[PDB]
Design a protein around this ligand. Structure first.
Ligand SMILES: Nc1ncnc2c1ncn2[C@@H]1O[C@H](CSCC[C@H](N)C(=O)O)[C@@H](O)[C@H]1O
Ligand SMILES: [K+]
Ligand SMILES: [K+]
Ligand SMILES: [K+]
Ligand SMILES: [K+]
Ligand SMILES: [K+]
Ligand SMILES: [K+]
Ligand SMILES: [K+]
Ligand SMILES: [K+]
Ligand SMILES: [Mg+2]
Ligand SMILES: [Mg+2]
Ligand SMILES: [Mg+2]
Ligand SMILES: [Mg+2]
Ligand SMILES: [Mg+2]
Ligand SMILES: [Mg+2]
Ligand SMILES: [Mg+2]
Ligand SMILES: [Mg+2]
Ligand SMILES: [Mg+2]
Ligand SMILES: [Mg+2]
Ligand SMILES: [Mg+2]
Ligand SMILES: [Mg+2]
Ligand SMILES: [Mg+2]
Ligand SMILES: [Mg+2]
Ligand SMILES: [Mg+2]
Ligand SMILES: [Mg+2]
Ligand SMILES: [Mg+2]
Ligand SMILES: [Mg+2]
Ligand SMILES: [Mg+2]
Ligand SMILES: [Mg+2]
Ligand SMILES: [Mg+2]
Ligand SMILES: [Mg+2]
Ligand SMILES: [Mg+2]
Ligand SMILES: [Mg+2]
Ligand SMILES: [Mg+2]
Ligand SMILES: [Mg+2]
Ligand SMILES: [Mg+2]
Ligand SMILES: [Mg+2]
Ligand SMILES: [Mg+2]
Ligand SMILES: [Mg+2]
Lengths: 307, 53
RNA sequence: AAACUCCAGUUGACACAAAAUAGACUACGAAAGUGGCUUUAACAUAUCUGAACACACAAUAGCUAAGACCCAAACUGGGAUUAGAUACCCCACUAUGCUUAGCCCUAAACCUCAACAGUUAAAUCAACAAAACUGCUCGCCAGAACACUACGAGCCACAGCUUAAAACUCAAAGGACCUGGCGGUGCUUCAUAUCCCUCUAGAGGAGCCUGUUCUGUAAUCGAUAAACCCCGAUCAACCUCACCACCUCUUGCUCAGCCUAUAUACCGCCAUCUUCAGCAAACCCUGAUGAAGGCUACAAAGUAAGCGCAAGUACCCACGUAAAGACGUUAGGUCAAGGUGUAGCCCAUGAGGUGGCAAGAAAUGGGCUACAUUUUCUACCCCAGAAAACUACGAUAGCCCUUAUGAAACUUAAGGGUCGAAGGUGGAUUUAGC
């Protein structure tokens, strides 16, 4: 089981209260969305996700609360249009909870292709076939040249040896198609000597697969999480009420950079800033909680109030 | 400045990301459309035959 | 940014903290150390040398106990920064720095110069440092690393100090200097279409032309950062042709042949700095005859052939533009101009014939034509009339037809008809011109 990351902070931070309407741009499993519909029984909430499986959960979970939760499906960029059809263009949303990353269910189900450890089709796509033409990670690796492929791993994955892990993929694809997660992991792990398979360690000084970051890189480029994060935050601001508390959760510093500067009005690469950081601190969950849920160790919560 | 006359007084987020995500997304989509060292001797030790000649 | 707002400014009262100026002085003490004032005590030795351990000392930090606490301040917390920042930067505060009484006994505790005595004549002297030595004595050293380590022993030391190996391992480790390279290296002067700003017209957006990449194909090759990319080509329908497929020939157009490998064997012809001014034989001299170095014009060791620049010549001048531009740099480009070393093929890696490839999912370089009113069309070649936004501007594209060239033309070129698209003067960036 996966406990919602920093659920206690996000609830206190947003202080859901009667007469307030809230939005959730990443319903996913719904653990955070349900923790918010428990504190305040009179709350009004809106949900959204890129995964139709996640949108079905919300629809099934809508039975628990008929109207307090309203389920929606679509990307961050498509969220404004979807919500504009409802007609809440001003929105006056008291808070927008923009949880980020991959869902626990998405990466716990091997079929979805997110887990390198298990064997599934190399999808790595949050979309669940809602757009059957959306390229999957397998397509990205088989098509792009070494120079192009390196860029994805170098930036999104923080891959120092971009040229080395990219050449191996180009050679492997020619021999046979790259269609499975374990096949990719072996291809990436082959780039380095046999010792290097698990030499790399996590931020907690815990050994991890050498291709762990490579999968994150392909995950970010298939789902364009970074560019979609900029539009999603911008859309939230337009639909966010004045005096309304925004709360994001950047699993990695990479996406946190966009959240870090957006709230501070700093150039992603003068007019007055329009945000109030009630909870400036960007901290991981309690160390006691990190061990329980290592997946959320790097969760950086950035809260702000619109000005 | 005092002498001067002032008159009557009153586009892609991909670049920010660092990669052209749109162009690459098209490139993969276009592909999808078709789918569906050596030793160096020390210079001082280099051998000569001038004396032998 | 956080932080304080019992805060800040003026005036007065005020310490168990630290001691501007003097001090540009170079003193005192065994060293460590000693720099506000005063007083008291007080700075061993009428040969010299003499200890890791004896004797007595010994900065900073640290320990034990009790005090002081202005300020500074490990740690810690907070605020930034960053891919990360348990750093550098900002704020707060503690151990601690201070006093007392005990410990601990370590420093790049270093003039990196042992004490004492003597000399300035020899040879001045590896180098650098700090001129070179002599007498005498104590301590110390004997390739690197292991190793300010292990064990032993002593110690108020208990994560400590002093003394201090061996095994395995290596052919070096090391000192000083010189050159080159490099420096998120200093200073000064510069760049003239030139590094930045300034001036003009462009590229980067659109369509088309063309090259390249990639992909595709049974189906060349080479160039490919500046110094490749309308480049070898002042040029590919066959031919050209070197490619692919099939068939055919074997002393073969040649006293054979090979566009087979190697441009990292080369000649030849070139790129590049060069929008440079230097290169350099033969001598001479300095450094002790070391690697190295060689200029001063009221001149102090350089002289220098030759090459380059220059001069001269070409074009319309003595101007400008050409041309020229050494040595050397990038094993730069080219074995596919031709020639050729080396290696390879010889019923095939050679020769001939027939047909065929060379496309665009895309990306990108260069160019063309445009987006119009300083424009569009016509007359004219500058005193004109019309056009001027969905019948305007705009394709040199698409499609259809004719013609030219050829044996061969959906293909190549020209012309006509039809068609009337994107484009509304182009972000970061970037090119050229005195
Ligand atoms: N651009 C995007 N638009 C919408 N949903 C997105 C998205 N990128 C990611 N998501 C989804 O947002 C979720 C983030 S991870 C899951 C968090 C969720 N609150 C939970 O219940 O655990 C995933 O379901 C993911 O598929
Ligand atoms: K004083
Ligand atoms: K010293
Ligand atoms: K030097
Ligand atoms: K332009
Ligand atoms: K040559
Ligand atoms: K040749
Ligand atoms: K040859
Ligand atoms: K162009
Ligand atoms: Mg004595
Ligand atoms: Mg002694
Ligand atoms: Mg002794
Ligand atoms: Mg001692
Ligand atoms: Mg002491
Ligand atoms: Mg002390
Ligand atoms: Mg203080
Ligand atoms: Mg204190
Ligand atoms: Mg000292
Ligand atoms: Mg002595
Ligand atoms: Mg030794
Ligand atoms: Mg020591
Ligand atoms: Mg010891
Ligand atoms: Mg011992
Ligand atoms: Mg263009
Ligand atoms: Mg080549
Ligand atoms: Mg070559
Ligand atoms: Mg080159
Ligand atoms: Mg032919
Ligand atoms: Mg041909
Ligand atoms: Mg041949
Ligand atoms: Mg060469
Ligand atoms: Mg002249
Ligand atoms: Mg010239
Ligand atoms: Mg000349
Ligand atoms: Mg070469
Ligand atoms: Mg043949
Ligand atoms: Mg036409
Ligand atoms: Mg004819
Ligand atoms: Mg028209």
């Amino acid at each position: 089981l996966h406990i919602p990351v920093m659920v206690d902070e996000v609830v206190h931070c947003l202080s859901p209260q009667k007469g307030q309407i809230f939005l959730d741009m990443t319903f996913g499993s719904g653990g955070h969305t349900k923790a918010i519909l428990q504190k305040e029984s009179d709350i009004v909430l809106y949900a959204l996700d890129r995964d139709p499986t996640a949108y079905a959960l919300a629809e099934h979970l809508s039975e628990l609360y008929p109207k307090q939760i309203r389920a929606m499906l679509g990307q961050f960029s498509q969220a404004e249009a979807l919500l504009m059809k409802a007609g809440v263009q001003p929105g006056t949303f008291d808070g927008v909870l923009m949880d980020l990353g991959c869902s626990s269910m998405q990466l716990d189900t091997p079929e979805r292709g997110f887990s390198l450890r298990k064997d599934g089709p190399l999808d790595m796509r949050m979309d669940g076939g809602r757009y059957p033409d959306m390229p999957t990670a397998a397509d990205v690796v088989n098509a792009l040249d070494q120079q192009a492929l390196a860029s994805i791993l170098r930036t999104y994955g923080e891959e120092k040896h971009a040229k080395k892990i990219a050449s191996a993929i180009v050679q492997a694809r020619s021999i046979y198609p790259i269609t499975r997660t374990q096949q990719l992991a072996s291809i990436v792990a082959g780039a380095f000597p046999p010792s290097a398979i698990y030499t790399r360690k996590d931020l907690l000084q815990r050994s991890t697969h050498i291709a762990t970051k490579t999968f994150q890189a392909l995950r970010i480029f298939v789902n364009n999480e970074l560019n979609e994060l900029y539009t999603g935050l911008k859309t939230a601001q337009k639909f966010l009420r004045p005096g309304g508390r925004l709360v994001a959760l950047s699993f990695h510093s990479l996406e946190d950079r966009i959240v870090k500067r957006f709230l501070l009005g700093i150039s992603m690469t003068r007019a007055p800033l329009m945000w109030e950081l009630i909870h400036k601190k960007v901290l991981s969950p309690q160390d006691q909680d990190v061990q329980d849920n290592p997946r959320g160790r790097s969760a950086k919560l950035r809260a702000a109030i619109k000005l | 400045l005092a002498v001067a006359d002032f008159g009557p007084r009153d586009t892609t987020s991909s670049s920010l990301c660092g990669i052209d995500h749109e162009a690459l997304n098209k490139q993969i989509m276009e592909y999808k459309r078709r789918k569906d060292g050596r030793k160096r001797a020390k210079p001082r030790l280099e051998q000569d035959s001038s004396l032998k000649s």
